[PDB]
């Protein structure tokens, strides 16, 4: 893992020592090459998971996320190349440094072996993301959005710290292999239930549960494009990954401590998907779509069947890529019309015919088009939940209908219809934007070709 | 003596209601008097009769919260068959919060206090069953 | 010894109480502090004489010396506050509330 | 612009709790959760009862 | 003491008048000299927790 | 009704309120040594009482 | 490299991370016992010093 | 906790007893990080005083890095000594009191009836 | 002040605490306390403005009362055990009063109302001494008697001060008062962990000092003393913003920064000792600190506040004030977690 | 010379090289059980030193 971490660190010296002219090109290129290097973690020809040292490890669950993180950084730089067009060189380099630091910390987090590695490297992500939202955001309420994002997560996390310390005192260690191979059954004492909650709540907040999902619609419509991309591609999955790694010890309490959160997920999914129908902000609509998908992920993880885990992982990756693409597209139209309303710009298929194609493909990934890995994930989660209780199909079906509905609503409202001819400023699509969308789609298509890579530990 | 306060847990809840209500009322009154002494020592009032009215109001309010809490907790534990179930202390703490809201003439305090005081009481009961220890002594 | 120590402890307690509750004039508070100093010195003196510990009789004098030094500092501060406000009233010492 | 502002940032500032609002919010939030709770709990408890006794036959459930 | 400057340097600024059993002017031992000496010699070596 | 109003009131804004109420309750001190030392006296008494009752 | 490298390295990881755990719990036990019984190198609180006692013949025989 | 350990010598940085431990390797990650901290401190000083961040004050930067490494070496040595002392006292005490730290005998997994909780 | 007064006064301020920590005798520790008390006051009242005089008087009265209470404790311990040091057999009330009076000296809640006022009144270069160097002696006096302290009293004071400092920080706009409240909170942590393992109390003291001194010198740089005033550093001195942000966040106690290590290690010890409720509450309430530090960070570094026409001449003129110690302490305080094992 | 600024291109590949070396060191330290595991333990072939080095 240290053949992937160190190049990432060295990106920073490159960013700061490069000449002002070539800095963007150099960092983008070397970040792509770091992404290439990260593929070495897919040479798992045996069931023995990789453990590169006492500190860093990898698994079938961590390799896809690490590779996704590596892949995102070049795309984040391309997406940020524009709105930073007229800032001073040091400020541009600061932005690039923030993104590089975010990648470093996230890779280390996903590759951490001890949960008190994880608890530090997980919260260290707050600083770069908070800076990205607050400093380079546009509208005034970005400060409030930053405050929400910081403190929701910190309130969630502190109880996680307490629980982890108790765990270490009780067990003697926090290496996840050791916890897995020496776990023991919890008893249904009230203190154990309180623990279960303390361990699970920070991750559930980062996987915004229906009742604690108010920090996404704000953080996203106040954050720049790169912030939104990294956030709702990787940060949101920190919660799922933590939950998956930590639930091993917290058994058998889950059987009855999951009813509340399963119910909240399976209801908030419908509520948020419906909210997407009548929202006048494209960024917000995408954010609430993300909330619904993470609701599904949470339900599956909290039922813990092999299908649940594998489908949850698949959908984690699929949502990463798809939501990222959607946000880049919306930012594309925003960079021109300088507004976030969906109603304002319409019929843009009459002037951006190809970007309309990318819009269509993204909407299909969102609505879950077979055989796309997005569908595969949702289908397998549905099978798991139906096994868990055969009545969940009602909620699942209502959500499927509404998902298709807002997914096509975006397209019809924006791409189709009479062109708002008064928009003189609409300019031909930049090769940068088109290449960004292509780099988002092509990995999705290749993984749909080869799903075996993105299955979880179970399958 | 501290015997009076430690007698609260002589017999599980649902029994000796009147005694437990007395004990919680006394504890609430003591807390109220302490708070009133602080609130008069700082932020003085114009009249000494105003100060004594303030101490009376604080003391009576705190005593009322404590009395309602004890009464409702014991009544719940008695009417339902669960003596040591923290939901009872939660309902009692909610009753205390609602009484505070009434005393202050505000529904927002009623709701916030219900949630917070009920959680505090439930956690207290859970601690007493599970053996938690506040203010421990160095064991290392 | 026992009754004497009880009364002396009560005296120090009363002087501490007087210091803690003010009454306008800062000079009176300084005097109350000075009275606590007196009581503490007497306590130490009687304890040493009772125990026949002549190696601890150097210490009451140090108490007096340092208490005198702090009392002098207090008087100088009184002079400065008086120059500022025209009186020694402690009510005037309220600017830093903001 | 005015329409979006009115449907976004003017809401909570121009919100006041009322009896009707409190009841409607509390029901529309919690009540559906309670309903689905009872549904799933009864279904899964019946399933567990049958599975325990052995009445339920899991003919070819291999993947669960 | 928090920092043992005196033990480090070998000096005794204030360690010689700590208890009633220390040297007194003109060899006038304080009240309970024998008792204090016994207690302190008993309590040397063993820690305070064991001495108690 | 729920997402933009009740959830915000219940979780974020209730906490924000309560903490602002408590800071405005505590911080605003008239700034007089007489009252401050009266409070110190109450601390004196409370520590004495705790010591006595706990024995 | 091949499966052996990963498998046996993992064995070494487990060895180290189990011994560390047992030693940490053992540290808890030992410190508890030393604090509670004062019989060990640690938690040896100080007592006054005998060296500065005065043993010379005093001016009163019965001292 | 370790202050009263028998044989403690007051205010001695490295007691002579410490020479028996393997001394730090001078390319240790800790000392390298110390050097990095010193270099960054030099750069920060330049930036604050409004100087060429990397070009100016090379003597200052060299002094900073060398001073950080120099202090780090000795501090690391003392820390190694202290942890080694802790382990020594640990194991000595445990050996002395076998009664209060009995060695557990572990039953194999066959004989242990671990409850099974279906995940249905 | 003439040079000879500077020498003598500064030397006495330095002497007092050294006497306290190198004295085996309680009366000599009290002598060190009195040395610090007497010598600081002239530095406080050096300005001779109406606010300065009142701040000095408040300090004087409070500290004198604390010293007398401590002296009573010493004298009664003498009456009981014929000695000048606290022993295991010493009466419990004596130790209670000592803890209470040293708490008043340190500024801990509920004896905390005096510290904010004095810090607001006095200038920054003396505020640094007040909030750093003057705490070493009292905390040393406690640490020398740590095995005998009262867990209930100490935890009560500590949690009280955490809550009070956190709540007080929000309302204040003044940097001087904000730093006073931060001092209160960090001392709350220090005393919370004192009875269990004083090594971590000293670790927290070190890290708090190493974080506060840089911040105080940062304020001294432009004599900033208000949120609005510090908001103008993006114009007056842009370079410092990065490290100011990092340092405020560290003091708040975010994981990657060093500030985590004190709180994390202290929570770990308390949990080892089964102090779960107090540990949880303290950790929870230590987040208001992050809030009222994040407001500062927003005001200074992440947003650019309105500036004035006359700042252009401040730009024109040269600056030579930041020290080497600023850079050293700031980096070594906000970039040292990876060396944490060596610290504890 | 254009090395003036093309020297910067050696940082990242140096990062990769250095990381690989450090990985080798990390595997060096974890040598025990080199050939002492139930599944894979074998007698070394003639003319051999280390199983996985
Ligand atoms: C068994 C499994 C079977 C799977 C089939 C599942 C069917 C799902 C149905 C989805 C319906 C999609 C749809 O309606 O059309 C969208 C889309 C819209 O087309 P359009 O309206 O003509 O766009 C014209 C632009 O507006 C204006 O630009 P233009 O007119 O100049 O376009 C010229 C031409 C130029 O096209 C290109 O230049 C293609 C370059 C492709 C590079 C691919 C690299 C792969 C690297 C691997 C490593 O078309 C494009 O530009 C399309 C670019 C995007 C193609 C991305 C590839 C998608 C493959 C889907 C799988 O049509 C497609 O290109 C989709 C391809 C057909 C669907 C898949 C059928 C299987 C064929 C496999 C071979
Ligand atoms: C690589 C990593 C490098 C780290 C780089 C900087 C890290 C940045 C973080 C800043 C905070 C670090 C300090 C943390 C800390 O103070 O730990 C608590 C640490 C815990 O001490 P302790 O175990 O409770 O008892 C210490 C005794 O007071 C006294 O114990 P002792 O009598 O056994 O001897 C104390 C020792 C102390 O040596 C030191 O220099 C310690 C200084 C630590 C501050 C950072 C250096 O030796 C000396 O005093 C110097 C000897 C000079 C004459 C030799 C002939 O506090 C101290 O030791 C400082 C007390 C002042 C002693 C002088
Ligand atoms: C993170 C927290 C970020 C807070 C926001 C800070 C900020 O906004 O900056 C001021 C920004 C205003 O920027 P500006 O108006 O364009 O002029 C400020 C320059 O210092 C104008 O001064 P200059 O152009 O004369 O000097 C530029 C300076 C470049 O110096 C900078 O201004 C950037 C310093 C912050 C770099 C952050 C590194 C992130 C670490 C990732 C881990 O030197 C270089 O161009 C390259 C030198 C290598 C980078 C310097 C690194 C030395 C300290 C490393 C300590 C790491 C602490 C962690 O607002
Ligand atoms: C610049 C490079 C200068 C040239 C290289 C130095 C010359 C040389 O060849 O010696 C190589 C020198 C010695 O290598 P070796 O001991 O012979 O080979 C075995 C490895 O070192 C095996 O390493 P090890 O296991 O023996 O030592 C591990 C040690 C390594 O200790 C370290 O030095 C860590 C360095 C951190 C990067 O401690 C750790 O385990 C690292 C944990 C530290 C905490 C990390 C996560 C906390 C959150 C991150 C916060 C970062 C600070 C704040 C950032 C700014 C925020 C505003 O190693 C290094 O220079 C790099 C160390 C890489 C360690 C892992 C980095 C992650
Ligand atoms: C050991 C035994 C522990 C017993 C714990 C008892 C806790 C009592 C509750 C805390 C007292 C708070 C005093 C208070 O009520 O605030 C008064 C004043 C605010 O002013 P006012 O508007 O007049 O009063 C409103 C009160 N709701 O605000 C203030 O006066 C500020 C009070 C700050 C100091 C409070 C110290 C409480 C803990 C003392 C431990 C000793
Ligand atoms: C117990 C109460 C002791 C006496 C209380 C005296 C009256 C009082 O209000 O207490 C505070 C007092 C300052 O009172 P003052 O500022 O003069 O205003 C009086 C308004 N009626 O402060 C004082 O006058 C100091 C009181 C010291 C009492 C020492 C002897 C008490 C013996 C019992
Ligand atoms: C289960 C635990 C997890 C849940 C944790 C929830 C903690 C969340 C804390 C969020 C605090 C943010 O605090 C936020 O402060 C801003 C100040 O700009 C307030 O902002 C608002 O305040 C008031 C409304 O009351 C208006 O007059 C003002 O104009 C407006 O900006 C927000 O209403 C408040 O929400
Ligand atoms: C369990 C502990 C959890 C702690 C974590 C949560 C942190 C809470 C942060 C509390 C502070 C938030 O600070 C928030 O500030 C805003 C303004 O900025 C206040 O809001 C204010 O807005 C304007 C003035 O600005 C007024 O019209 C309004 O009446 C007033 O309330 C909020 O009422 C306060 O809550």
Swiss-Prot record, chain A:
Catalytic activity annotation: a ubiquinone + NADH + 5 H(+)(in) = a ubiquinol + NAD(+) + 4 H(+)(out)
Subunit structure: Core subunit of respiratory chain NADH dehydrogenase (Complex I) which is composed of 45 different subunits.
Role according to the record: Core subunit of the mitochondrial membrane respiratory chain NADH dehydrogenase (Complex I) which catalyzes electron transfer from NADH through the respiratory chain, using ubiquinone as an electron acceptor. Essential for the catalytic activity and assembly of complex I.
Stated name of the protein: NADH-ubiquinone oxidoreductase chain 4
Membrane topology (UniProt): Multi-pass membrane protein
UniProt xrefs under PANTHER family: NADH-UBIQUINONE OXIDOREDUCTASE CHAIN 4
Assigned GO CC terms: mitochondrial inner membrane; mitochondrion; respiratory chain complex I
Keywords: Electron transport, Membrane, Mitochondrion, Mitochondrion inner membrane, NAD, Respiratory chain, Translocase, Transmembrane, Transmembrane helix, Transport, Ubiquinone
EC numbers on record: 7.1.1.2
Transmembrane segments annotated in the record for this chain: 23-43, 60-80, 90-110, 113-133, 147-167, 194-214, 224-244, 257-277, 284-303, 308-330, 350-370, 392-412, 434-454
Species of provenance: Mus musculus (Mouse)
UniProtKB/Swiss-Prot annotation, chain D:
Transmembrane region(s): 23-40
Entry coiled-coil feature ranges: none
Subcellular location: Mitochondrion inner membrane
Assembly information from the UniProt record: Complex I is composed of 45 different subunits.
Described function: Accessory subunit of the mitochondrial membrane respiratory chain NADH dehydrogenase (Complex I), that is believed not to be involved in catalysis. Complex I functions in the transfer of electrons from NADH to the respiratory chain. The immediate electron acceptor for the enzyme is believed to be ubiquinone.
Family under the similarity heading: Belongs to the complex I NDUFB4 subunit family.
Full protein name: NADH dehydrogenase [ubiquinone] 1 beta subcomplex subunit 4
UniProt organism field: Mus musculus
Full-length numbering of the shown residues: 66 to 129 of 129
UniProtKB/Swiss-Prot annotation, chain E:
Annotated localization: Mitochondrion inner membrane; Mitochondrion intermembrane space
Motif (Cx9C motif 1): 32-42
Transmembrane regions: none
Subunit comment: Mammalian complex I is composed of 45 different subunits. This is a component of the iron-sulfur (IP) fragment of the enzyme.
Function (record text): Accessory subunit of the mitochondrial membrane respiratory chain NADH dehydrogenase (Complex I), that is believed not to be involved in catalysis. Complex I functions in the transfer of electrons from NADH to the respiratory chain. The immediate electron acceptor for the enzyme is believed to be ubiquinone.
Family: Belongs to the complex I NDUFS5 subunit family.
Domain notes: Contains two C-X9-C motifs that are predicted to form a helix-coil-helix structure, permitting the formation of intramolecular disulfide bonds.
Protein name according to UniProt: NADH dehydrogenase [ubiquinone] iron-sulfur protein 5
Part of the full-length chain shown: 2 to 53 of 106
Swiss-Prot record, chain G:
Localization (cell): Mitochondrion inner membrane
Domain of life: Eukaryota
Described purpose of this protein according to its UniProt entry: Accessory subunit of the mitochondrial membrane respiratory chain NADH dehydrogenase (Complex I), that is believed not to be involved in catalysis. Complex I functions in the transfer of electrons from NADH to the respiratory chain. The immediate electron acceptor for the enzyme is believed to be ubiquinone.
Subunit structure: Complex I is composed of 45 different subunits.
UniProt record similarity statement: Belongs to the complex I NDUFB5 subunit family.
Record-given protein name: NADH dehydrogenase [ubiquinone] 1 beta subcomplex subunit 5, mitochondrial
Organism: Mus musculus
Covered range of the whole protein: 127 to 189 of 189
């Amino acid at each position: 893992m240290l053949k992937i971490i160190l190049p990432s660190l060295m990106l920073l010296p490159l960013t700061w020592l490069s000449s002002p002219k070539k800095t963007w090109t150099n960092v983008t290129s070397y970040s792509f090459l770091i992404s290439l290097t990260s593929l070495t973690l897919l040479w798992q020809t045996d069931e023995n998971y990789k453990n590169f040292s006492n500190m860093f490890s990898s698994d079938p669950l961590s390799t896809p996320l690490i590779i996704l993180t590596a892949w995102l950084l070049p795309l984040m730089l391309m997406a940020s190349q524009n709105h930073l067009k007229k800032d001073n060189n040091v400020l541009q380099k600061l932005y690039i440094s923030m993104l590089i630091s975010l990648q470093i910390l996230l890779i280390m987090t996903f590759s951490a072996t001890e949960l008190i590695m994880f608890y530090i490297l997980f919260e260290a992500t707050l600083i770069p993301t908070l800076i990205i939202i607050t400093r380079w955001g546009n509208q005034t309420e970005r400060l409030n959005a930053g405050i929400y994002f910081l403190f929701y997560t910190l309130i969630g996390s502190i109880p996680l710290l307490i629980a982890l310390i108790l765990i270490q005192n009780h067990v003697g260690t926090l290496n996840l292999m050791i916890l897995s191979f020496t776990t023991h059954t919890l008893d249904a004492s009230w203190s154990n239930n309180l623990l279960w909650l303390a361990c699970m709540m920070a991750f559930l907040i980062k996987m915004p549960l229906y009742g604690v999902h108010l920090w996404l619609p704000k953080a996203h419509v106040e954050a720049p494009i790169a912030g939104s991309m990294i956030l709702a591609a990787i940060l949101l999955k920190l919660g799922s990954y933590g939950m998956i790694r930590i639930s091993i010890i917290l058994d058998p309490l889950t059987k009855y401590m999951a009813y509340p959160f399963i119910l909240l997920s399976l209801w908030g999914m419908i509520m948020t998907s419906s909210i997407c129908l009548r929202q006048t902000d494209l960024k917000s609509l995408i954010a609430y779509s993300s909330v619904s998908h993470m609701a599904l992920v949470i339900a599956s993880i909290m039922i813990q069947t092999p299908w649940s885990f594998m489908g949850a992982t698949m959908l984690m990756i699929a949502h990463g890529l798809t939501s990222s693409l959607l946000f880049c597209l919306a930012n594309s139209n925003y960079e021109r019309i300088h507004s976030r309303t969906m109603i304002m710009a319409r019929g843009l298929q009459m002037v951006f015919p190809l970007m309309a194609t990318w819009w269509l493909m993204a909407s299909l990934a969102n609505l879950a088009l077979p055989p796309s890995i997005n569908l595969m994930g949702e289908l397998f989660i549905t099978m798991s939940l139906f096994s868990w209780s055969n009545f969940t199909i009602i909620l699942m079906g209502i959500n499927i209908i509404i998902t298709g509905m807002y997914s096509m609503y975006m397209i019809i409202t924006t791409q189709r219809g009479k062109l708002t001819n008064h928009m003189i400023n609409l300019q031909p699509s930049h090769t940068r934007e088109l290449t960004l969308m292509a780099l988002h789609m092509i990995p999705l298509i290749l993984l749909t070709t080869s799903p075996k890579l993105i299955t979880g530990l179970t399958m | 003596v501290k015997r009076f306060f430690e007698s609260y847990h002589e017999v599980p809840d649902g029994t000796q209601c009147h005694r437990k209500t007395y004990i919680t009322t006394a504890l609430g009154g003591i807390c109220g008097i302490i708070g009133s002494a602080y609130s008069v020592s700082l932020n003085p009032a114009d009249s000494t009769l105003e100060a004594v009215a303030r101490v009376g109001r604080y003391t009576f309010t705190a005593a009322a919260i404590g009395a309602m809490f004890g009464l409702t907790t014991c009544v719940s534990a008695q009417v339902r068959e669960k003596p040591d179930d923290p939901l009872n202390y939660f309902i009692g703490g909610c009753a205390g919060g609602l009484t505070l809201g009434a005393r202050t003439h505000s529904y927002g305090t009623a709701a916030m206090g219900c949630v917070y005081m009920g959680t505090a009481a439930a956690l207290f009961k859970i601690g007493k069953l599970e053996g938690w220890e506040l203010f421990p002594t160095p064991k290392v | 010894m026992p009754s004497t120590f009880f009364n002396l402890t009560m005296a120090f307690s009363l002087s501490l109480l007087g210091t803690l509750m003010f009454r306008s004039h800062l000079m009176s508070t300084l005097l109350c502090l000075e009275g606590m100093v007196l009581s503490l010195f007497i306590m130490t003196s009687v304890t040493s004489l009772n125990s026949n510990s002549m190696s601890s009789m150097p210490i009451p004098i140090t108490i007096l010396v340092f208490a005198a030094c702090e009392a002098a500092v207090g008087l100088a501060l009184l002079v400065k506050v008086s120059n500022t406000y025209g009186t020694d009233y402690v009510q005037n010492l309220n600017l830093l509330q903001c | 612009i005015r329409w979006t502002y009115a449907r976004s940032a003017n809401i909570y500032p121009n919100f006041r709790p009322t009896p009707k609002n409190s009841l409607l919010g509390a029901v529309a939030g919690f009540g559906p959760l309670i309903f689905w709770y009872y549904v799933f709990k009864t279904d899964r408890d019946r399933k567990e009862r049958l599975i325990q006794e052995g009445k339920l036959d899991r003919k070819f459930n291999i993947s669960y | 003491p928090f920092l043992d400057i005196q033990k480090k340097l070998g000096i005794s600024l204030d360690r010689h008048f700590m208890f009633l059993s220390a040297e007194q002017p003109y060899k006038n031992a304080a009240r309970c000299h024998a008792f204090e000496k016994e207690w302190i010699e008993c309590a040397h070596g063993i820690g305070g927790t064991r001495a108690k | 009704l729920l997402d933009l109003i009740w959830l915000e009131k219940t979780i974020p804004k209730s906490t924000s309120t309560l903490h602002t109420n408590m800071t405005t309750l505590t911080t605003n001190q008239k700034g007089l040594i007489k009252l401050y030392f009266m409070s110190f006296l109450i601390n004196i008494i409370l520590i004495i009482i705790l010591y006595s009752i706990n024995l | 490299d091949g499966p052996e490298k990963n498998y046996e390295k993992t064995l070494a990881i487990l060895q180290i991370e189990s011994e560390k755990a047992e030693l940490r719990l053992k540290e808890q036990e030992v410190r508890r016992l030393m604090r509670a019984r004062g019989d060990g190198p640690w938690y040896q609180f100080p007592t006054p010093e005998k060296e500065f006692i005065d043993h010379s013949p005093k001016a009163t025989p019965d001292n | 906790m370790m202050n009263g350990r028998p044989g403690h010598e007051p205010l001695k940085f490295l007691p002579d007893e410490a020479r028996s431990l393997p001394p730090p390797k001078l390319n240790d990650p800790r000392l390298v990080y110390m050097g990095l901290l010193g270099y960054c401190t030099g750069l920060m000083d330049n930036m604050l005083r409004m100087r060429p961040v990397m070009r100016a004050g090379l003597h200052r930067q060299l002094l900073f890095v060398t001073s950080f490494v120099f202090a780090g070496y000795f501090y690391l040595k003392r820390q190694n000594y202290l942890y080694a002392v802790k382990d020594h006292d640990m194991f000595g005490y445990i050996k002395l009191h076998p009664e209060d730290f009995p060695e557990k005998e572990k039953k194999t997994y066959a004989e242990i009836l671990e409850p099974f909780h279906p995940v249905r | 002040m003439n040079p000879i007064t500077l020498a003598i006064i500064y030397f006495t301020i330095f002497l007092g605490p050294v006497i306290t920590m190198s004295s085996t005798n309680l009366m000599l520790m009290w002598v060190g306390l009195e040395f610090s008390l007497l010598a600081i006051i002239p530095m406080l009242i050096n300005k001779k403005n109406p606010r300065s005089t009142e701040a000095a008087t408040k300090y004087f009265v409070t500290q004198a009362t604390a010293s007398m209470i401590i002296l009573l404790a010493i004298v009664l311990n003498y009456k009981q055990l014929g000695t000048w040091m606290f022993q295991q057999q010493t009466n419990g009330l004596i130790l209670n009063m000592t803890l209470m009076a040293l708490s008043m000296k340190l500024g801990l809640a509920p004896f905390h109302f005096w510290l904010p006022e004095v810090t607001q009144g006095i200038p920054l270069h003396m505020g640094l001494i007040l909030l750093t160097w003057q705490k070493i002696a009292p905390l040393s006096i406690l640490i020398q008697i740590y095995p005998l302290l009262n867990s209930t009293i100490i935890l009560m004071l500590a949690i009280t001060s955490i809550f009070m400092g956190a709540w007080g920080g929000l309302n204040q706009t003044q940097m001087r008062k904000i730093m006073a409240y931060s001092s209160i909170a960090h001392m709350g942590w220090m005393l919370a962990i004192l009875p269990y393992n004083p090594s971590l109390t000293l670790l927290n003291l070190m890290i708090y000092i190493i974080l506060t001194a840089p911040m105080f010198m940062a304020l001294m740089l432009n004599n900033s003393m208000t949120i609005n005033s510090i908001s103008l550093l993006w114009n007056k001195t842009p370079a410092m913003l990065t490290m100011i942000s990092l340092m405020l966040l560290s003091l708040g106690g975010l994981p990657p920064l060093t500030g985590f290590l004190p709180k994390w290690i202290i929570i770990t010890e308390l949990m080892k000792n089964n102090c779960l409720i107090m540990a949880t509450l303290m950790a929870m309430m230590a987040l208001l600190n992050l809030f009222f530090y994040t407001r500062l960070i927003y005001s200074t570094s992440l947003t650019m506040f309105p500036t004035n026409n006359n700042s252009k001449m401040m730009t024109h003129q040269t600056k030579t004030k930041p020290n080497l110690m600023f850079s050293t302490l700031a980096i070594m305080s906000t970039m040292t977690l990876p060396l944490a094992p060596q610290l504890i | 010379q254009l090395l003036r600024e093309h020297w910067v291109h050696i940082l990242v590949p140096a990062g990769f090289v250095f990381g690989c070396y450090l990985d080798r060191k990390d595997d060096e330290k974890l040598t025990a059980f080199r050939n002492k595991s139930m599944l894979f333990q074998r007698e070394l072939r003639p003319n051999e030193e280390v199983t996985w080095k």
